[PDB]
Scaffold this active site. Structure first.
Site, PDB file in Angstrom:
ATOM      1  N   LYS A 180     -20.119  -3.842 -12.453  1.00 57.07           N
ATOM      2  CA  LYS A 180     -20.557  -5.095 -13.072  1.00 57.07           C
ATOM      3  C   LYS A 180     -20.907  -4.860 -14.533  1.00 57.07           C
ATOM      4  O   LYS A 180     -21.565  -3.872 -14.848  1.00 57.07           O
ATOM      5  CB  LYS A 180     -21.762  -5.688 -12.323  1.00 57.07           C
ATOM      6  CG  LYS A 180     -22.205  -7.046 -12.839  1.00 57.07           C
ATOM      7  CD  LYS A 180     -21.203  -8.144 -12.500  1.00 57.07           C
ATOM      8  CE  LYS A 180     -21.594  -9.442 -13.162  1.00 57.07           C
ATOM      9  NZ  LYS A 180     -20.698 -10.556 -12.764  1.00 57.07           N
ATOM     10  N   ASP A 195     -11.940  -5.117   3.069  1.00 56.08           N
ATOM     11  CA  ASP A 195     -11.006  -3.994   2.956  1.00 56.08           C
ATOM     12  C   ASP A 195     -10.261  -3.945   1.617  1.00 56.08           C
ATOM     13  O   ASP A 195      -9.076  -3.624   1.569  1.00 56.08           O
ATOM     14  CB  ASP A 195     -10.015  -4.025   4.117  1.00 56.08           C
ATOM     15  CG  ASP A 195     -10.725  -3.904   5.446  1.00 56.08           C
ATOM     16  OD1 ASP A 195     -11.593  -3.007   5.577  1.00 56.08           O
ATOM     17  OD2 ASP A 195     -10.423  -4.705   6.353  1.00 56.08           O
ATOM     18  N   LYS A 244      -0.040  -6.824  -8.022  1.00 57.57           N
ATOM     19  CA  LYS A 244       1.080  -7.492  -8.690  1.00 57.57           C
ATOM     20  C   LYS A 244       1.420  -6.796 -10.006  1.00 57.57           C
ATOM     21  O   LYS A 244       2.590  -6.566 -10.288  1.00 57.57           O
ATOM     22  CB  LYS A 244       0.759  -8.973  -8.948  1.00 57.57           C
ATOM     23  CG  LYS A 244       1.896  -9.719  -9.618  1.00 57.57           C
ATOM     24  CD  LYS A 244       1.470 -11.082 -10.155  1.00 57.57           C
ATOM     25  CE  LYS A 244       2.604 -11.739 -10.907  1.00 57.57           C
ATOM     26  NZ  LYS A 244       2.372 -13.188 -11.080  1.00 57.57           N
TER      27      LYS A 244
END
Ligand SMILES: Nc1ncnc2c1ncn2[C@@H]1O[C@H](COP(=O)(O)OP(=O)(O)O)[C@@H](O)[C@H]1O
Ligand SMILES: Nc1ncnc2c1ncn2[C@@H]1O[C@H](COP(=O)(O)OP(=O)(O)O)[C@@H](O)[C@H]1O
Ligand SMILES: Nc1ncnc2c1ncn2[C@@H]1O[C@H](COP(=O)(O)OP(=O)(O)O)[C@@H](O)[C@H]1O
Ligand SMILES: Nc1ncnc2c1ncn2[C@@H]1O[C@H](COP(=O)(O)OP(=O)(O)O)[C@@H](O)[C@H]1O
Lengths: 494, 483, 489, 218
Positions: free
Chosen positions: C123, C116, C380
């Site tokens: 890539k 999830d 973050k």
């Protein structure tokens, strides 16, 4: 209030579109070269005509203003963008308590079709702020203008590539300067073209030379393109050209004064001038410079020494060309059979009712429509926007180059002739050419750009009229010409 | 048409503002000074921006159609704007303006930092296929985005009774694919989205749970209940629900769960009644297999509304004018819980105040969906589901606390384990639990704010005026302290 | 991951999963369409999902430290945009290819979906051998590659967020973020979220180095605590009385050993590139790690004798190599095979394990802890604050208030006679409170993610009657989620 | 232009030209470098010029008029950015390939340089046979391809300006400009300069139909 505030004028513009759209519809399906069934083609044509007719976007605003006395006031304003087939949108801003959403929508649609007949690449737009400017100080008018600019910019209703406003009879160049200054200082600070967000600006703020006389010059060129065409003039029983022609102007404003001056310059004799307060008349002629100087020192044309006090309007005065140059309903079904002019040059929006148009067609009177003839100011609006995009005045780098080439050409003729006839044969510019070379400035190129546009659009309207066998119905030809162009942009874009 | 389409409901909202603005005016000057207060109240009242649109649509049969639509943004004192989109032939500019203003005041009472907004597309959705409804939705999204009437930080629309989560998904998909392609928060341009598209858990019952929490906050305040001659709590209370849609069903199920007995349920087609009680699960199952509540075996049929049925709490849960000056003196309930917008006329409000009947207003009680809308917008800004990184951390702390009690007692003198209920809370901990707590907290904080406003201005049981005054005080302070 | 046979494997896993979901997807559709039109929508969407949407090939100049110029070839594939931004590592290797970058981007789409993580797969590969370049040249390559990707929409906090690989590290990620934030993304408040795997001083997240190992433990734990799956394998739930063997003693193998031992599981054998060690009574992970740190190898460990066929309950292939094949799969004595690395089991070995009732916990799920923590690092940087910064002290005070409430209530109940009943935190709880930092919340987010994904995979396996075929259940779970995003949009 | 031998030809023409200029370029270098380092600069720059800087490969969905979905494969190569925007046609053909699009992009770079046109070279290809599609399907393909190029910097008035081919025409160019100006380039005053070969009603230029023939005469 003006003719542009009248609800009957809005119904007129809608009726002109409906008439034009039904005429083009049958010919548009034949010209469709797409790989569709005939049923898909008609759905596409009718569908696109249905999209074109209404305004795409209308923004209504409520914004605060602090008056000079300290009290607050809520100002109501609106801006309609009729079409985005061409971006940016273009259109004036009216400061009047007589403005309405319906006015702003109808005048935006009128601007779409007006720009299309003169090949100006803008969709139509129109704004209105519901205030009486006489009740406000210059400081309060600046506050209203700057805040209105801010609210339009935050919603995509002002920007050099989105919507470029302009002044009106109720607004001027100082207000346009405040719009550009507010936009360039805040929302459009990172835009190199921020000063192209609005036209009608003063020269010190990016304005264009030749803006004050743009409409009057456009009215002259428009009359000129038809008055020099012997095919149209033979139908009216007249000879081509301005020589031995008489004219009357109803409305002695900026457009009335400029038209009167340029027709006079070319040999046409002004027999009568009408104003909001009475009229003057002289069958021997009225000088435009003498009349302009009289009005500048007395406020009115009444009492002019070289003319007689004509009672009422000059619409029924014996002349060849009648020029309604004031925004009011003048030619109606009651006075249309009493008009003695063979050419009616609309130097204002909506001076002739549809019933008067019908009478003029029955009487073989040629009406040069407002959609075309009143597009000079719009044409120079486009050039001001281009000037701000260019970031240079017109001719700045080529005037001296052209001057040297002209002198080299005259020197080549002189040397060739002296060589042929032996040895001095001085080949010098005429007094008029020398004056053109010495005073060469931006206004000369703007005037040229306008003259070329009025000439190309007159031929386009003549061709559209001959295609649909419209004859002297130039108004329908101009609307059909505008709708054909707007349709093709939508159709070829998908 | 709905009560939200009614021009008299727009006049009502305007009158509620005028009433509230005249009450706060005198106290605002105390906290040239009257010119600033009146001036700011004059700015707040009208909608700042209204956009009218005309846009083409190609029908499934090939023919073109011009669709008319509008969106009003009442206030930008808090950005973005927030408000639903209605697909109805009964929409109008006046509707969209009044409902946008209602949303500014509703957001202010529940401390949701959004200005009010409302959109309307003048079409009857029954006349269009799903493909045509998608075309209308995507094109309307494009026209709003180009003019600043949709964007994560500009204007965040939502669904209505006429629109759903599939339409919201199309709005977010169109915005993120075109205009907002470079925006990391593009999916936050609209709320009411499906879970697979950035939707929030706990959105379906948000309005119903808000009605329950709103009622619960006043029903458990002994000061207000003593004035109505009742004891606090849902035990030994009777209630009737008028309108058995999703709000009525949810409110019925939540009050029943806490001891309240449902004595009557009203529907668009007749009503049912049982003084011994009506089970919400049995009634919901009956309606799901027969389309209506008529003929329910454990209830008696009545031809008409349940507004005059003998009960303690009356819950108008349908968007229509129900309580008027003619039936207000026949109401037997002591509490009227407005689960929909505008079910009581100003004349009925006056009668209820004279009869000591407490009306919990729609501005507060119907703000549960608006509160969880704010949380969905925040979830899309956060780019993470609520509690994802802290549920396991909280669980370990709880176990460490119980282990600390066990070790301390074994040292002093003993298994210390969670209750069956606590263990289930820990094991099933998911986003909906944080959304539910956030909604319950908002409803509780706003109820106390409304009670304090009513006590400050000596309004008594006039909670509607208290809620409007509370909203106007908050909007005024934002304008005043911004300059 | 450079092997063309591994790309064919990933393609085959998608094809197998897509054919299984196809029949159930048409039946679960509630749209107003005919049954033949609903079937066209399902197959149509599965056909869109399978190939990479975008592949960018680059040629960019680099001036070497000796003055000579070099043209560097690089590529980046974005498999899916159903979830933006895209996410995926960058490989610096002469063995990279467009086919590698496309297959690994598709693998990342399905790996992000099972845990999830709201990102489409991506890539990148730069065709250079990093050993042939100085740090200055590697910085030049990294910064120029970042510039070329940014100008074409192949790097940005909301567009594509790259990450390191076995061939790249945190210093290169720092250069990517620094190049992006100084040029293309200068006006972006979230410019430092354009890449993950960054050092802590540049916006990196605590708990990134042990993320894969913690996730391997949590993945095993979630199936080992499930009595339904354990009864099928003839075992009791929990780690108590369980034996395990780890093949590959790197950062994943060591960490998995360390956490499994901590919960009661006994390590009976440890395999390495150079030989293996064995002790049926147990091998201590701290003693083995200390031995390897002073001798370079586990060979010669005093408390062990000098491991895929070793008698154990859990076998953990933790090294990126082909280990379980059709020849040694019938000799495996473990009941659980925990793939702690990509592709350690061949499809032929999977078939044998299913016939032998051996549960294989797939790499697509079990080797996804690093990806889970990458999402948290991106979050973050969006948050612009470390996790727990404002709530650790608040939580600590609440915990003390709770213990004080228990103490006061008991002293009130039992009186003055008896005395004070001190309610204090355990030594372990006190250490948790004192050392409370971001890594504790990241470890929480990871444990919850693995727990929730294990239950989702179990429900998918039960829905399609897959039993112990957890690999197909993980691929089917990923394809169902990606399909639903396209279908409901 | 689809022939692999024609691609080898263009590469060979560059190699031949680059070896001839190499000796004269080092003499004209007035930089304060050693003669060996001057040759490294010349050869180094010629090595940068030769290959395409960027190649974008796309896979995008299209819903056919019958309801069925189809995945369309397309590519666009930008050979050089020494002059921006890049410039180059779009081919709709099942015979297109990445190698074709790369070689024709390089050819366009050198073609623009000989006629002092300030654009780098570019070329696009969509692997479809236009005869198998309706005008509605060709519009869908064109508009979606435009969207995928715009999001990755492969179309824009100052980035990359495509053009028609023998396989594409002015209606497709009009759809490209309309899609770009409606979505990604909505805030750009020059959005209609994102593509050339447009009809006159959409910003096209007079004298475009006879341009190649006139240039052949000239
Ligand atoms: N406002 C407009 N709406 C629709 N079409 C327009 C408009 N203005 C110009 N056009 C048409 O668009 C085309 C642009 O041609 P171009 O040669 O670039 O400009 P022009 O000839 O007007 O100077 C012409 O066919 C012109 O008639
Ligand atoms: N929609 C709104 N309009 C005006 N003020 C608002 C609105 N929503 C919240 N406020 C007020 O703005 C302030 C924000 O306080 P804060 O503590 O940050 O938020 P809250 O307490 O609502 O979670 C409070 O005084 C709150 O009542
Ligand atoms: N990479 C992905 N691709 C497709 N669907 C996804 C992806 N990641 C998550 N989802 C799904 O999208 C939905 C988002 O739910 P939400 O509660 O916001 O997030 P989560 O529960 O994953 O923390 C869930 O149903 C989840 O399974
Ligand atoms: N595509 C191109 N690539 C490289 N150089 C170019 C290109 N097009 C033009 N130039 C060169 O760039 C310079 C620009 O000179 P300028 O006088 O501005 O333009 P031009 O003479 O081409 O009209 C000239 O030396 C010209 O030869």
């Amino acid at each position: 209030a003006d003719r542009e505030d009248d609800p009957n004028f809005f119904k007129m513009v809608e009726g002109f579109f409906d008439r034009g759209a039904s005429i083009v519809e049958d010919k548009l399906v034949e010209d469709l070269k797409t790989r569709e069934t005939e049923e898909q083609k008609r759905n596409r044509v009718r569908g696109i005509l249905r999209i074109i007719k209404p305004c795409n976007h209308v923004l209504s605003l409520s914004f605060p203003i602090r008056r000079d006395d300290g009290s607050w006031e809520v100002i109501e304003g609106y801006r309609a963008q009729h079409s985005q087939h061409r971006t940016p949108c273009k259109g004036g801003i009216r400061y009047s308590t007589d403005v309405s959403v319906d006015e702003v929508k109808a005048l935006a649609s009128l601007m779409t079709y007006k720009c299309a007949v003169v090949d100006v690449p803008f969709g139509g737009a129109k704004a209105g702020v519901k205030i009486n400017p006489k009740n406000y100080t210059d400081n309060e008018l600046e506050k209203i203008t700057r805040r209105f600019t801010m609210e339009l910019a935050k919603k995509g209703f002002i920007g050099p590539g989105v919507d470029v406003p302009a002044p009106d009879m109720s607004t001027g160049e100082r207000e346009m300067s405040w719009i550009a200054d507010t936009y360039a200082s805040t929302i459009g600070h990172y835009d190199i073209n921020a000063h192209a967000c609005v036209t009608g600006k003063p020269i010190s703020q990016g304005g264009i030379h030749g803006r004050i006389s743009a409409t009057g010059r456009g009215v002259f060129h428009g009359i000129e393109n038809f008055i020099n065409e012997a095919s149209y003039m033979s139908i009216l029983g007249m000879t081509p050209g301005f020589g031995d022609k008489t004219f009357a102007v109803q409305g002695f404003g900026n457009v009335g004064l400029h038209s009167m001056r340029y027709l006079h310059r070319f040999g046409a004799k002004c027999v009568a001038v009408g104003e909001s307060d009475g009229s003057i008349w002289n069958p021997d002629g009225i000088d435009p410079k003498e009349l302009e100087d009289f009005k500048l020192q007395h406020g009115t044309i009444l009492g002019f020494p070289k003319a007689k006090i004509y009672e009422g309007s000059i619409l029924e005065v014996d002349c060849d060309i009648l020029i309604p140059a004031a925004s009011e309903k003048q030619l109606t079904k009651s006075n249309a059979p009493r008009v003695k002019a063979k050419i009616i040059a609309e130097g204002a929006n909506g001076p002739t009712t549809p019933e008067a148009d019908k009478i003029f067609l029955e009487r073989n009177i040629m009406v040069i429509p407002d959609l075309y003839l009143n597009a000079g100011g719009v044409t120079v609006s486009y050039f001001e926007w281009l000037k701000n995009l260019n970031h240079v005045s017109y001719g700045r780098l080529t005037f001296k180059y052209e001057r040297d080439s002209n002198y080299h050409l005259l020197m080549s003729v002189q040397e060739s002739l002296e060589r042929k006839f032996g040895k001095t044969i001085p080949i010098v510019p005429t007094a008029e050419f020398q004056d053109r070379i010495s005073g060469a400035s931006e206004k000369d190129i703007v005037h040229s750009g306008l003259a070329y546009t009025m000439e190309r659009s007159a031929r386009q309207i003549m061709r559209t009229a001959m295609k649909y066998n419209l004859g002297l119905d130039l108004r329908t030809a101009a609307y059909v010409n505008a709708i054909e162009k707007v349709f093709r942009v939508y159709n070829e874009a998908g």
